[PDB]
Structure formats: structure tokens, C-alpha cells
Amino acid sequence: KSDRQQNQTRLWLNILRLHGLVFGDLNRQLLDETGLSLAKFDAMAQLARNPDGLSMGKLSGALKVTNGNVSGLVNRLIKDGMVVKASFSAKLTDAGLTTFKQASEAHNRILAELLRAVSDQDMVEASAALRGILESMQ
Template sequence: MMPLDAETALADTPPGHKDELRLWLRLLTCTNLIEAEIRRRLRAEFDTTLPRFDLLAQLERHPAGLTLGEISRRMMVSNGNVTGLAARLEEEGLVERRVSTTDRRAQSLRLTPRGRREFARQSAAHEGWVAELLAGLSDSEREALHRLLGRTKASVRAGLQEGGT
């Protein structure tokens, strides 16, 4: 039996419930369902976690390396979280620390050759999983959804600017 999500829980709300709230709950439910399945598959197939995968992805995009602070900002987590993840990935030989070329007090992380190979395996599987989960949508539906979500993102950003946030 599927767990009850916020959108389903509100399915019988009285008329007049705001469409915007219902839309937000639909977006949140989709995100949560996909994320939970990706987390489950990463654990089952690679004995890893989504935060570890995300850290490797950040380093894959920046072959010269990133400081712990840069990684924490990009992942939107605390430096402490990144420090612990990085230490474990370093112990496994997936990342290496280097003294920063711009600030000798700072260290940067980058993928090792082994880390690149492992991330390539994980990211190929991840791409396939996402494709599988969205396979119920036609090409034109995916294009329309992508376009509408782009407009949604712009609307949210505009609302944040107007609100002074």
C-alpha cells in the first residue's frame, strides 16, 4: 500500500481550497516520490546515499576541484555535513584533498580516477531511473511540462524579488 501523501490527504478538502496550494502540493508529492525511489535505488544498487551521489556530481562538474565551502553552498547543506561526507569518500579513495591554489589555508576536493569511474556508473544508472519514472509521459508532454515548470520557476523568482526575500 502506498503511503498517504499531502496531496492525497487534501483530496477531500472543501471547495474553495486554493488552486495554488493544490498545485504546490502536487509538485511536492512528485518530487518526494521520485526522490524516495532514487534514494532507495542508490542504496540497493550502489550501497550509497543521495548526498554522497550529489557531492560526487558537484565534483564531476568541476574537475579542478571545489572547496568545502563551495560544495556546501552548491548542495545547500552545512559545512559540517560536507566535511563528514568528504572524509568518508576520501577514505574510500573516491575523492582527494588538495591545498587550494588561491588560498593555502583552504583545501579543495576533486574526484580521483576511481571516483570518476564510480560516479560514471552511478550517474548512468540514475539517468536510466529518471527516464523510467517519467516514461509514462509522451515527448510532447515532457516538453510542455518542462516549459511550464520553467515559467513556474520564473514566477517564483519574481515573487521572491517582489517580497524582498
């Protein structure tokens, strides 16, 4: 293995470690506090940003967590009374938007708590490097 292959192995394993450590706890705590999944919270965030409504494809395209069988994810949200159901454009119910703001508060508190020992410098440097990686992947 070259420096480069070793660099790549290491990087991806690190992303997977941080991703897993944050996701499992964020998800389990968001559920306990709010009864919302991270996958659910994620979908609602795209819709709260877009109050004119989003189609299944554009919603799917905007998700930060991959899938949820997107329509099956939307189906759970409709049954929960978060997304309106009277091709489909998805909008938060009035109560979905109230829940979203409370859940948004909870989400950022939980994340802050998970990262509470993490230094600003490490976060700024990880982020500037990951943005560089992303940019060059186009």
C-alpha cells in the same frame, strides 16, 4: 482562504509530493545499483563538473540536495575512496570519477524509469512554470 492562498498551498504540496515520490526511489535504487546515495551522487556531480577542486563552501553552495552536513558528507566520500585526502579543496579520486560515470548512467536510467508514463508536454510545462517561479523569486 483566497484563490491565491489556495494556489500556494496546492503548489507546495504538489512539489513536496513529486519531490518525495522521486527522491525516495531514486535514492533507494541508486544505492542498490551503485552503493551511492543521492546526497553522495549529488556532491560528486559538482566535483566532476569542477575538476580543479572545490572548497567546502563552494561545494556546499553548488549542492542540489540541501546539505548532508556538507563536511560530514565529504568525510563519508573520502572514506569510500571517492574524494582525495592525502583549507580543503575536494577532488574525485580516479576511481571516484569512474564510479561517477557508471552512477550517472544508472541515475538517468532510474529517473527515466520512474517517469516512464509521464508525458513530454507535462514535463515541459511544469518546467517552464517552475523556471518562471524561480526567476521571479530571483
